[PDB]
Design goal:
heterodimer; A: mainly beta; 2 domains; 8-stranded antiparallel beta sheet; 4-stranded parallel beta sheet; 10% helix; B: mainly beta; 11% helix; globular; binds a molecule of 5 linked components (NAG-NAG-BMA-MAN-MAN); binds oxtoxynol-10; binds a molecule of 2 linked components (NAG-NAG); binds 2-acetamido-2-deoxy-beta-D-glucopyranose; Genome polyprotein (chain A); viral protein; flavivirus; dimeric; NS1
Chain lengths: 341, 338
């Protein structure tokens, strides 16, 4: 599964039903789909030329770049799928260099080196090592040049970026608002806000947690921003937008951002309560509702949040927002986020 | 679960992404192109509204000015019903709806939910009912109404005072090379071609409410002098509402009704960069009042293709673009100051 290559036509054209207006309507415009919560991946990354990429790497290798960290899971999946190919490319040209791709657990961190146009390894992702520290790795060096048709999925071809930026690739971003529901999204983030008495964040699904910055061009309601109010941190591709807020909550810099997939919404973790209490503990690291031993922590408080509570759902269970604390300071087997972003 | 209650569902072809995708999300359509006839306003309570009106008149509100063409059509269509309801309550008061020509100006008064014998809706600027004593932007859409012919939307009186355009009917979105700010009468399009910039805008009428920041893209660090469509004319405070070489078209042909903006030459005309060209002025039509064509145009420091308006009486150029020949032959120029 990695085949190599080697009616306004700028717009979407089709039909949809608008459930709110209760109208079936055809024509042209902009259609944003939910691709984060989709069964398969409709999209796969590809290099414009594997040979080109191999050249990019060996060059960066000469200039002392020991490896790379992917921007996203999709990018990782490319490096994973194209490594054997890149390696036979180097091998057959007499280049003493092999690409090595390690499993990625947790958030995709940024790095400061950049691949440019044109030991003996190039290490993609993995744990932090003294041998190949992040500071000598490349990150966010590629972007989408063109899209390629496929039967099963659609191809995205990567070129080398012309400049140095921390911005997420805008080619794959879809932001939209209609019927007072607002969506900031790309291939791995789906962030939904809605008007109900007030405008506020309602739900978010993060396929992984990345470290690029959400571009202003693709951001709604981005005036008069106070970053410390932004639920999802801008250092974690949180859109710098007033939609990325919830009354009674500040930036979740210590949310469980290193668990892999994270779903944010506002409801109670199963079998728990949350109470307003001026005697509750101050905000701290996001905390799970099950201990290491597995037992359920039922009673929770908050000093000044609003209900329903900010809830995180991950592979290992349910967590609460930073402002929500265990009512009883007696449980010692806590599982808490050790992130600071 | 709520995502069903407010979303769109269907299929579309995305040429840019070379794919056919189905699913759920937000589909923003092109409505200023023929779809204004498939949407009607109706007051949610003609009875209540009548009471609201007789109260406002009783408090020194001589009349009203519609936010938009669609609102005006509702007034035109409900006045007979309103009047006959005012009769039944024994109220010396009748609604008068005059033709609306030009831009839909704003007014400072508001209706509330709780001399002459008339309530004048729209029209020219009388002194028997000045704009300063009229209400404006007191209505918003409560819910939508199913129809085969048209989608109905029912209006409530606003609980609050604001210059903001009703947000319920706004659709704003960006994907691939394309950014749209739109509602039922405005379609404002910008595109990424080397740079993000305004490419085209169609305005069914020119209104004077303000485009809400909640539905504005790229709204950070705004220099209002660079916004092409003025914020006083529902221009979005967006860096998408910009074109290099051009500043705010405060003196556009905004009083002509329908206006379309794009970047292209007026038929039979040329535009050349000249250091000796005149400075920004009111926008000028390519035909003179008699009906003669002006062919030669200059600009000092605009970029090309030229900023172009099209209205019901012809083609016009942006404020920076000036007739190269000084033998001024009674031009037709915008008199609007926005
Ligand atoms: C969209 O936004 C609206 C608000 O604009 C939300 O509506 C609110 O929903 C919440 C719960 O979902 C409601 O809160 C509940 O109120 C019940 C009755 O209200 C009492 O308190 C008010 C205080 O102002 C008094 O005025 C009133 O007379 C009543 O005495 C309570 O019975 C509920 O209590 C539960 O929670 C508390 C929390 O501590 C527990 O201690 C209780 O034991 C009990 O379990 C609760 O407080 C609120 O009333 C709604 N407001 C309005 C205006 O309707 C919608 O929920 C939101 N939509 C979505 C989808 O989220
Ligand atoms: O349209 C209505 C069908 O119902 C929607 C079901 O989901 C559709 C999702 O799209 C995937 C379609 O699956 C079939 C794959 O083909 C895609 C388009 O077919 C073009 C094939 O052309 C062959 C090229 O030579
Ligand atoms: C690209 O820009 C980034 C940030 O704008 C640069 O990252 C900084 O690099 C220096 C030295 O490498 C560090 O001390 C900083 O902490 C980095 N800031 C970050 C990572 O936010 C990066 O060096 C630039 N890369 C190139 C090739 O110019
Ligand atoms: C009360 O309001 C009515 C409706 O606006 C006024 O009637 C108009 O008066 C002007 C005066 O020049 C005429 O040109 C219009 O033709 C009248 N409208 C008609 C006949 O439908 C009336 O003058 C006002 N009375 C006042 C201010 O005392
Ligand atoms: C997108 O912008 C490019 C400029 O980068 C436009 O290309 C120019 O097109 C005009 C007329 O077609 C030519 O006179 C120029 O010489 C072109 N420039 C270059 C560098 O080729 C292009 O027309 C724009 N396309 C759209 C659809 O707006
Ligand atoms: C509406 O609000 C504006 C902004 O404060 C104010 O200037 C205006 O007088 C208000 N009008 C009414 C009728 O309250």
């Amino acid at each position: 599964x990695x085949x190599x290559x080697x009616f306004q036509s700028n717009a979407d054209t089709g039909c949809a039903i608008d459930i709110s207006r209760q109208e079936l309507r055809c024509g042209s415009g902009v259609f944003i789909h939910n691709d984060v919560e989709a069964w398969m991946d409709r999209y796969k990354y590809y290099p414009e030329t594997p040979q080109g990429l191999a050249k990019i790497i060996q060059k960066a290798h000469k200039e002392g770049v020991c490896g790379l960290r992917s921007v996203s899971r999709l990018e990782h999946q490319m490096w994973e799928a194209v490594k054997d190919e890149l390696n036979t490319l180097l091998k057959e040209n007499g280049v003493d260099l092999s690409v090595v791709v390690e499993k990625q657990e947790g958030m995709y961190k940024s790095a400061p080196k950049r691949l440019t146009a044109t030991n003996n390894t190039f290490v993609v992702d993995g744990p932090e090592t003294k041998e190949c520290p992040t500071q000598n790795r490349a990150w966010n060096s590629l972007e989408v040049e063109d899209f390629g048709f496929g039967l099963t999925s659609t191809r995205m071809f990567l070129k080398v970026r012309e400049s140095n930026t921390t911005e997420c690739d805008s080619k794959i971003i879809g932001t939209a608002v209609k019927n007072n529901l607002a969506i900031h999204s790309d291939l791995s983030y789906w962030i939904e806000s809605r008007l109900n008495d007030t405008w506020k964040l309602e739900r978010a699904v993060l396929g992984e947690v990345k470290s690029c910055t959400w571009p202003e061009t693709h951001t709604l309601w981005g005036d008069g921003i106070l970053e410390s109010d932004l639920i999802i941190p801008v250092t974690l591709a949180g859109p710098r937008s007033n939609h990325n807020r919830r009354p009674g909550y500040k930036t979740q810099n210590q949310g469980p951002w290193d668990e892999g997939r994270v779903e944010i919404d506002f409801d109670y973790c199963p079998g728990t309560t949350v109470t307003l209490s001026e005697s509750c503990g101050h905000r701290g690291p996001a905390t799970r509702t099950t201990t290491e031993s597995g037992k359920l922590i039922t009673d929770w408080c908050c000093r000044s949040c609003t209900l329903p509570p900010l809830r995180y759902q991950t592979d290992s269970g349910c967590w609460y927002g930073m402002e929500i604390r265990p009512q009883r300071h007696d449980e010692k087997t806590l599982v808490q986020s050790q992130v600071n972003a």
